[PDB]
Design an enzyme around this catalytic site. Structure first.
Site, short mmCIF file in Angstrom:
data_model
loop_
_atom_site.label_atom_id
_atom_site.label_comp_id
_atom_site.label_asym_id
_atom_site.label_seq_id
_atom_site.Cartn_x
_atom_site.Cartn_y
_atom_site.Cartn_z
N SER A 140 39.17 31.36 40.44
CA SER A 140 40.97 30.71 39.97
C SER A 140 41.23 30.14 40.85
O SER A 140 40.94 29.18 42.13
CB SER A 140 41.45 32.29 40.80
N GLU A 254 32.31 25.37 19.01
CA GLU A 254 33.09 25.41 18.26
C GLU A 254 34.33 25.29 18.68
O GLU A 254 34.96 24.79 18.06
CB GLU A 254 32.59 26.22 17.43
N1 GTP Z 1 41.98 39.39 39.05
C1 GTP Z 1 41.12 39.22 39.76
N2 GTP Z 1 41.86 37.94 40.97
C2 GTP Z 1 40.85 37.68 41.81
C3 GTP Z 1 40.09 39.13 41.95
N3 GTP Z 1 39.75 38.14 43.26
C4 GTP Z 1 40.54 36.70 44.05
N4 GTP Z 1 41.18 37.05 42.86
C5 GTP Z 1 41.79 35.94 42.37
O1 GTP Z 1 41.20 35.27 43.43
C6 GTP Z 1 42.35 34.57 44.91
C7 GTP Z 1 42.01 35.81 46.13
O2 GTP Z 1 40.50 34.84 46.30
P1 GTP Z 1 40.44 33.92 47.62
O3 GTP Z 1 39.81 34.98 48.36
O4 GTP Z 1 41.41 33.26 47.64
O5 GTP Z 1 38.81 33.21 46.51
P2 GTP Z 1 38.21 31.86 47.79
O6 GTP Z 1 38.56 30.94 46.53
O7 GTP Z 1 37.03 32.71 47.56
O8 GTP Z 1 39.20 31.46 48.72
P3 GTP Z 1 38.52 31.27 49.43
O9 GTP Z 1 36.92 30.69 49.66
O10 GTP Z 1 38.37 32.01 51.01
O11 GTP Z 1 39.40 29.45 49.56
C8 GTP Z 1 44.24 34.67 44.14
O12 GTP Z 1 44.06 33.85 43.16
C9 GTP Z 1 43.39 36.15 43.08
O13 GTP Z 1 44.39 36.26 41.96
C10 GTP Z 1 39.67 39.61 41.54
O14 GTP Z 1 38.29 40.88 41.58
N5 GTP Z 1 40.10 40.15 40.44
#
Ligand code: GTP
Ligand code: GDP
Ligand code: MG
Lengths: 451, 48, 445
Positions: A140, A254
């Site tokens: 993300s 593709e």
């Molecule tokens: N759809 C969805 N998005 C998720 C999920 N877990 C995390 N996210 C997305 O990822 C981010 C939240 O998780 P973070 O803890 O920031 O992930 P990270 O990259 O490990 O963070 P750092 O390493 O601490 O920077 C947000 O942008 C969320 O929308 C999940 O299970 N489902």
């Protein structure tokens, strides 16, 4: 004979990874120990599962994939969950302390310690490919592992694999909903870096799939474990030809020949249909055109920027299970006759298509719909401009106030980098407007006669 | 530079239709602007 | 005796190909593992036209089976009749095309090319008089379309008095299954029009309306469209394999079909096309074939040929029947639909008649037309190429396998000439004037 890689970065990646691998196991008949005691086969060899799994001397299969976050916890969870013995021990790669939603921890000051240990694991998976096709990479924009390290890894994959396809699968920022206050530095610092190292970059939106879940899956309590299971139906449908044999197969390389009109225009939005509860499934017969027309409804998109605010320009449109190419032919043409569904006048060829014989599986967790045939779709559009219009002004507000910039700088950056990233994102703003131009006519211009 | 688009959105807009070409026709047609000497035609009676 | 090689390349080309070598295998009593066990000795008696004879009375097709991926060659060998083919003829690569014609023509297909030619030599040095080479391939696709261009080009240079025939799947009026189909198509026409003797244009939209509206298939599959193409391939090549009142090979079609070596792209048709209840309520005659075969829906590309003029036609009829009757009906079409045809060509139709019908039929006719009405298809490719090229769109993939950007206009000027060439011969009459004089001017008004 052919192979590809999957890679799961930050806490968004590692979790969409579980859903996907949950499914792929289940879809192929592979179990949580890597066995397939599952079909009384007499021939074999493809077995197109080998593109995604490595076989073992005594018949265990092992997933051709790699995990990363910069703290263990989210990985210790898999490591002790039902797929402990499934996943390869050394493909589950872990730091100590997480990137904190700070891109500079992920790209620069922390990233640098584990990047070559990932790349070592990945060169050691290419030595298991018989022909490395490409890479499918899950993250993300809002995470700081998910932004910083995914874009470190794309720097590094675009050398070691400089010809192969690097395909991204983002959780992209919702319009009204956010999961970090530093959401705009991440989104732009990663997008500016991958904008020359990645081939395609597909979007899904949690604000969009929540409403699909309450509206049409008819679920009250949409968890991230449920929502990542819905996102998994797009990934399995996009990969179907590389998983099973089909009336009309598509290649890993593709999608981008058809979806990316200019190399910077690489943001196709993703979707699945039909999304029903089991009780609704009984009040729909679900013929191919019904799925197709539904799949085109704006409130049926798994990105919440509305296609009413833009033209469409390039599609790939993928069918599973019981499906007749003559129905696909007509239902496609039906959507084009409805030029009410706004599309760019200078790409009437706006579709590529693929039809696979193998029907979908649901991962059980409720009452099951009795599915026969399904549809998934990738679309490039200027609605993505409607999404980015805010995330861009958010970077303008944050950066004008210099809010939070001392965390990022302290941890490996300079303000001139925040300027370049935003500058290219202002070029990209004009790029999705240039693909919105109703072009001028060239007919009927001449020189006059020489005497 | 105050920023601009980077895609080649209209790079071929100097070219024009079409959709036809030529056609090859009985009124000339093999000639070029510098094939000198070798005068017409026809002997000295028609004429030199 | 008189041998042809068959080539099948990309996905539609290999699928059409495994209806051809199912249909013809069955038309010949070939077994799904290459045995022969057929019921008329006439079948066995011109077998070399398409086959090799292998030890222990086994039989091997002159199929050459090509691709840039490994899956269609699994799905054909796991498939019906996949044991009749020779293993050394399964030359598929390791890259795909991914609809890129240039990944075909410049890089990856150019990497297979020497290994495809290795089996083209084996097979042709093992003929006793090779006439020709048949290619089922794409045109708006990439895996077939971009291999097929380079393969024909090298074949034309190793074998230049042998015949060159092409079964191309053409972009359809309402749908595309590939986005770069105008690119894939224009580029292809440039390369082929110098080196083919024959190209067939075959439309999935034109076969869907056949299959759904005239055969009443509730569910028209590619399997059922490919049955029609293989009936077509079978049909135009009957007289090579069997006795008949009027026998004609591909070089005998060519000379009646091809007024100028530029003007060799054609539309095909088959007859009868009949639904299962209608088979009771219809009666099959040479007039029935004749009526249906010049009928605007029976055309396997998406035109009503009354939009232009026939230059040349061929009709290939199978079964036992009066040569009077078939001359008669052909005369009747030429004289009661006389305006369907161009007049600076007289008597515009070749006919040939074989004694052996399709295994599932009493009698059948196969048509081939050269008409100025199908320019609308090339006009469609030219404009839809322009909708991409005028904006530089998709060009960066072609240039990334290292094609030159100028070559796009070289092919486009060629297409724009070709579509003008069919248009300038449409109703291309002579026109004449009389000389004129005057009397003397007088003072009186
Ligand atoms: N759809 C969805 N998005 C998720 C999920 N877990 C995390 N996210 C997305 O990822 C981010 C939240 O998780 P973070 O803890 O920031 O992930 P990270 O990259 O490990 O963070 P750092 O390493 O601490 O920077 C947000 O942008 C969320 O929308 C999940 O299970 N489902
Ligand atoms: N009739 C027919 N069309 C096919 C079949 N397979 C693919 N097609 C169509 O043929 C065209 C080219 O497909 P394909 O051969 O997959 O393209 P390529 O692999 O990129 O050359 C598109 O219109 C496809 O939908 C088939 O079995 N029969
Ligand atoms: Mg993290």
């Amino acid at each position: 004979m052919r192979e590809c890689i999957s890679i799961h970065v930050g806490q968004a990646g590692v979790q969409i990874g579980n859903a996907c691998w949950e499914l792929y196991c289940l879809e192929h008949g592979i179990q949580p120990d890597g066995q397939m005691p599952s079909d009384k086969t007499i021939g074999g060899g493809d077995d197109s599962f080998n593109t995604f799994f490595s076989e073992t001397g005594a018949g265990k299969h092992v997933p051709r994939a790699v995990f990363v976050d910069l703290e263990p916890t989210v990985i210790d969870e898999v490591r002790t969950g039902t797929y402990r013995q499934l996943f390869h021990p050394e493909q589950l790669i872990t730091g100590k302390e997480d990137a904190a939603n700070n891109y500079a921890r992920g790209h620069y000051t922390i990233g640098k310690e584990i990047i070559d240990l990932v790349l070592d694991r990945i060169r050691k998976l290419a030595d298991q490919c018989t022909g490395l096709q490409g890479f499918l990479v899950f993250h993300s924009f809002g995470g700081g592992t998910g932004s910083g390290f995914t874009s470190l890894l794309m720097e590094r994959l675009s050398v070691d694999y400089g010809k192969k396809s690097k395909l991204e699968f983002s959780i992209y920022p919702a319009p009204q909903v956010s999961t970090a206050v530093v959401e705009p530095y991440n989104s732009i610092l990663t997008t500016h870096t991958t904008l020359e190292h990645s081939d395609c970059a597909f979007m899904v939106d949690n604000e969009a799939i929540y409403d699909i879940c309450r509206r049409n899956l008819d679920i009250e309590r949409p968890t991230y474990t449920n929502l990542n299971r819905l996102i998994s139906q797009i990934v399995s449908s996009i990969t179907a030809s590389l998983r099973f044999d089909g009336a009309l197969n598509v290649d890993l390389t593709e999608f981008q020949t058809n979806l990316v009109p200019y190399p910077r225009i690489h943001f196709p939005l993703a979707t699945y249909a039909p999304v029903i509860s089991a009780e609704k499934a009984y009040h729909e017969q679900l013929s191919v055109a019904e799925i197709t027309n539904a799949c085109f409804e704006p409130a049926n998109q798994m990105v919440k920027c509305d296609p009413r605010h833009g033209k469409y320009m390039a599609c790939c449109l993928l069918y599973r299970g019981d499906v007749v190419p003559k129905d696909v032919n007509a239902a496609i043409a039906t959507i084009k006759t409805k030029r009410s569904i706004q599309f760019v006048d200078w790409c009437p060829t706006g579709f590529k298509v693929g039809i696979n014989y193998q029907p979908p599986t649901v991962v059980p967790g409720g009452d099951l719909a009795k599915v026969q045939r399904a549809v998934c779709m990738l679309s490039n559009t200027t609605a993505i401009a409607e999404a980015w219009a805010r995330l861009d002004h958010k970077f303008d507000l944050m950066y004008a106030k210099r809010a939070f910039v001392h965390w990022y700088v302290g941890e490996g950056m300079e303000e001139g980098e925040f300027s370049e990233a935003r500058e290219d994102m202002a070029a990209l703003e004009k790029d999705y407007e240039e693909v919105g131009v109703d072009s001028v006519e060239g007919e009927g211009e001449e020189e006059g006669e020489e005497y | 530079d105050r920023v601009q688009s980077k895609i080649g959105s209209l790079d071929n807009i100097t070219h024009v239709p079409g959709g036809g070409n030529k056609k090859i026709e009985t009124h000339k047609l093999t000639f070029r602007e510098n094939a000198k000497a070798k005068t017409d035609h026809g002997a000295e009676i028609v004429y030199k | 005796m008189r041998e042809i090689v068959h080539i099948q390349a990309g996905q539609c080309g290999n699928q059409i190909g495994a209806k051809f070598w199912e249909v013809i295998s069955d038309e010949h009593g070939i077994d799904p593992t290459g045995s022969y066990h057929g019921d008329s000795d006439l079948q066995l008696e011109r077998i070399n036209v398409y086959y090799n004879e292998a030890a222990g009375n086994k039989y091997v097709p002159r199929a050459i089976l090509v691709d840039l991926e490994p899956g269609t060659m699994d799905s054909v060998r796991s498939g019906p009749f996949g044991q009749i083919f020779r293993p050394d003829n399964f030359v598929f690569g390791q890259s795909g095309a991914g609809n890129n014609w240039a990944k075909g023509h410049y890089t990856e297909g150019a990497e297979l090319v020497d290994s495809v030619l290795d089996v083209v030599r084996k097979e042709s040095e093992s003929c006793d008089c090779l006439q020709g080479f048949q290619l089922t391939h794409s045109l708006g696709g990439g895996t077939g379309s971009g291999m097929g261009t380079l393969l024909i080009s090298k074949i034309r240079e190793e074998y230049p008095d042998r015949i060159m025939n092409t079964f191309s799947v053409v972009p359809s009026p309402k749908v595309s299954d590939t986005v770069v189909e105008p690119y894939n198509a224009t580029l292809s026409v440039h390369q082929l029009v110098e080196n083919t003797d024959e190209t067939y244009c075959i439309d999935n939209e034109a076969l869907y309306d056949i299959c759904f509206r005239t055969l009443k298939l509730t569910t028209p599959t590619y399997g059922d469209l490919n049955h029609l193409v293989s009936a077509t391939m079978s049909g135009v090549t009957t007289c090579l394999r069997f006795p008949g009142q009027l026998n004609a090979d591909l070089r005998k079609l060519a000379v009646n079909m091809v007024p100028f070596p530029r003007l060799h792209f054609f539309m095909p048709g088959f007859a009868p096309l009949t639904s299962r209840g209608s088979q009771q309520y219809r009666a099959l005659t040479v007039p029935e074939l004749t009526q249906q075969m010049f009928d605007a829906k029976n055309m396997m590309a998406a035109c009503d040929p009354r939009h232009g003029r026939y230059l040349t036609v061929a009709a290939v009829f199978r079964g036992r029947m009066s040569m009077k009757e078939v001359d008669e009906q052909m005369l009747n079409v030429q004289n009661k639909n006389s305006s369907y045809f161009v007049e600076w060509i007289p008597n515009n139709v070749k006919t040939a008649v074989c004694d052996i019908p399709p295994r599932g039929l009493k009698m059948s006719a196969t048509f081939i037309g050269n008409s100025t009405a199908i320019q609308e298809l090339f006009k469609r490719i030219s404009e839809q190429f322009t909708a991409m090229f005028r904006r530089k769109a998709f060009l960066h993939w072609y240039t990334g396998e290292g094609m030159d950007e100028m070559e796009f206009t070289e092919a486009e000027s060629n297409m724009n000439d070709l579509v003008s060439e069919y248009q300038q011969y449409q109703d291309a009459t002579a026109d004449e004037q009389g000389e004129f004089e005057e009397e003397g001017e007088e003072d009186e008004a």
